[PDB]
Design an enzyme around this catalytic site. Sequence first.
Site, PDB file in Angstrom:
ATOM      1  N   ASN A  50       0.819  -1.214   0.000  1.00 42.28           N
ATOM      2  CA  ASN A  50       0.000   0.000   0.000  1.00 42.28           C
ATOM      3  C   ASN A  50       0.858   1.272   0.000  1.00 42.28           C
ATOM      4  O   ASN A  50       0.445   2.303  -0.550  1.00 42.28           O
ATOM      5  CB  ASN A  50      -0.988   0.018   1.181  1.00 42.28           C
ATOM      6  CG  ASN A  50      -2.151  -0.981   1.020  1.00 42.28           C
ATOM      7  OD1 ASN A  50      -2.922  -1.207   1.979  1.00 42.28           O
ATOM      8  ND2 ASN A  50      -2.269  -1.596  -0.137  1.00 42.28           N
ATOM      9  N   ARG A 105      -6.367 -13.555   1.047  1.00 41.19           N
ATOM     10  CA  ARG A 105      -7.741 -13.673   0.601  1.00 41.19           C
ATOM     11  C   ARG A 105      -7.927 -13.645  -0.912  1.00 41.19           C
ATOM     12  O   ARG A 105      -9.009 -13.953  -1.403  1.00 41.19           O
ATOM     13  CB  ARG A 105      -8.595 -12.578   1.268  1.00 41.19           C
ATOM     14  CG  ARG A 105      -8.435 -11.158   0.719  1.00 41.19           C
ATOM     15  CD  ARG A 105      -9.176 -10.139   1.608  1.00 41.19           C
ATOM     16  NE  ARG A 105      -9.399  -8.845   0.948  1.00 41.19           N
ATOM     17  CZ  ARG A 105      -8.587  -7.800   0.994  1.00 41.19           C
ATOM     18  NH1 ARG A 105      -7.465  -7.791   1.684  1.00 41.19           N
ATOM     19  NH2 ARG A 105      -8.885  -6.709   0.318  1.00 41.19           N
TER      20      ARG A 105
END
Length: 721
Positions: A180, A293
């Site tokens: 990020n 995920r």
Amino acid sequence: VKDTYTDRLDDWNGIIAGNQYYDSKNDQMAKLNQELEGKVADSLSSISSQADRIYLWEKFSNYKTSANLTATYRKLEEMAKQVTNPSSRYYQDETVVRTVRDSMEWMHKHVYNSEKSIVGNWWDYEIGTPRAINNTLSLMKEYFSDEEIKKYTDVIEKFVPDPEHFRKTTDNPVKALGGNLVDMGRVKVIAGLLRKDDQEISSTIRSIEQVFKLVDQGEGFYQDGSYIDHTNVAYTGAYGNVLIDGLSQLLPVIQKTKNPIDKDKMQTMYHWIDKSFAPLLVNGELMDMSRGRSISRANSEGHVAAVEVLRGIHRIADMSEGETKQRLQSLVKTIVQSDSYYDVFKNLKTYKDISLMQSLLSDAGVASVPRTSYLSAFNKMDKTAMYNAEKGFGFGLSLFSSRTLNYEHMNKENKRGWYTSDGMFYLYNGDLSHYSDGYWPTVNPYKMPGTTETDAKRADSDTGKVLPSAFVGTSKLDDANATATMDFTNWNQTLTAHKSWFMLKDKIAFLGSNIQNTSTDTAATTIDQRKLESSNPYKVYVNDKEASLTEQEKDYPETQSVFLESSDSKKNIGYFFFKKSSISMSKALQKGAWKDINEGQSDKEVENEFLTISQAHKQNGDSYGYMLIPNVDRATFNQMIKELESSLIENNETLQSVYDAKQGVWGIVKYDDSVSTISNQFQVLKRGVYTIRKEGDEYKIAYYNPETQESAPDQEVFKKL
């Protein structure tokens, strides 16, 4: 105004789209151009007109769902790409240019401006939508004024004023780290260039330099190659992808600004590639245990995800020189050429990326030699990756501990990942498609391969946990044997097991002891759940006699061996039970939809056939023990299991050990500090994990204490007899 900012934006345009490199006679480039043509045609035929409008696309119309902001702006970026491609039918098209301008203005005045606040996912407001706006403006900078470009980026500065933090406008901000933080660069370095803002550019590059530091704790890259994100989740293969993919795009730009990054301070990138990324790439596939995920996304199966990493490496090679460039090219080349299942070009999404890959593959000066054997113990994220080049299989064994979260279920994704780190294993063999073609929505999530579990129902709404114990990790001897335990307790503290693995070059032993169950649910270990190929059926043998598996589970008492025989030896799987064991097996069609495990995915039914092998544990103090032997034919398996008849040294509550007489190698796990005498040859003295080799009269010792995350001097832990 044309200047050094717009020079950098031209370079950016060359990276994010590469219209300058487009060649209509280049089949792979023409294929990507055609994809973009159709996307733009579909957007234009679909867009709401009249009233000027009122939402832009019906499919992406609820603006409280923040993914619809990003998806909308991404449609505009696609238009900008084509409006600036001389070979596109939309090149300089008056309707398209006005559609992008009008759509920017409409979204600005109705949906996304500095007067708004985050509704839904912060990531769309701070990264996805800012990236799409920036790239649109950059590509179409000759159709917008400087004033308009400031107007349309002011919102980016409202949501992302500070290059060190995300979620600044929320009551609970976060330090920008990891992948990020690289996305912070693609937001703020590009917005800074568009807005001619030297302080934005300089401060943001300074902030991004954090990414080059190896960490001892928290999020980031570790010395042992581990990568952690989201506080304590193993994440090399999703967030680390973003990090390498994004940074490799930014670097040619950053390095020509007034604030370039120092060479020695960028040297860490090659560490990431060799220590962190490479071991997780097998036959073109990025190991799912590193992807969190993202396994629950249909468009991101393991060979697709791998291309994010490969394209990052090939860009880094291009900015490097000499031997470092050729060796990085050679790494990409051999990985791509090993992949017979997935076409790498399907995830090369700009013309420069296509061009770089084509150059690499056709350049006879770039070596493509099959990769050698390796074994990486990623102890700081509780994963282990093993690859045997002689026989051609990979093995992933990775776990969790008091230091790491078992699975990430977030943003409605990965709803059934419950048991994916409970000592789950992966086998990478000649079936390159195994974990793809809808494995994730069709696998039975209650029977993850390798895991010992009760059959209690689980809620999709659950989230991950850490393990009570720190006694989880791997002791590696060589670069190619190495090895592990997990002091396992299940999710509701009703079941325990001491689970250990003995990686012995061409085979892996699985030992479980101390298996206890305080619940009224039934307990079992899934020995395997293997997804089948209809083109390549297995003939199944139990005790070297053919067996006919059915949808209904069948019991096989007194099993010494199971063999799955393919026409291709590189797909064969054998299981050797050290002591005859009572197992059950079935072959069944399993159906599911991706939406089942990820609310944002398709509800279309998918199906695959699976072969499941299980061992029930009806009593306290139960045990399992078997050797997984891949990539050999039936006769050779039968010989090997005779060689291994007495390979099991111990499998109890305090001591687990396997001996490979051919190699002269022992694996040992000790749960206490008793003196353990092994093979009437030596003693081992301390709780922890060992891999030992006898070479003539000397012993090579690899000891690890998983709880203190330390080795020890040889005399503290080992004594020759």
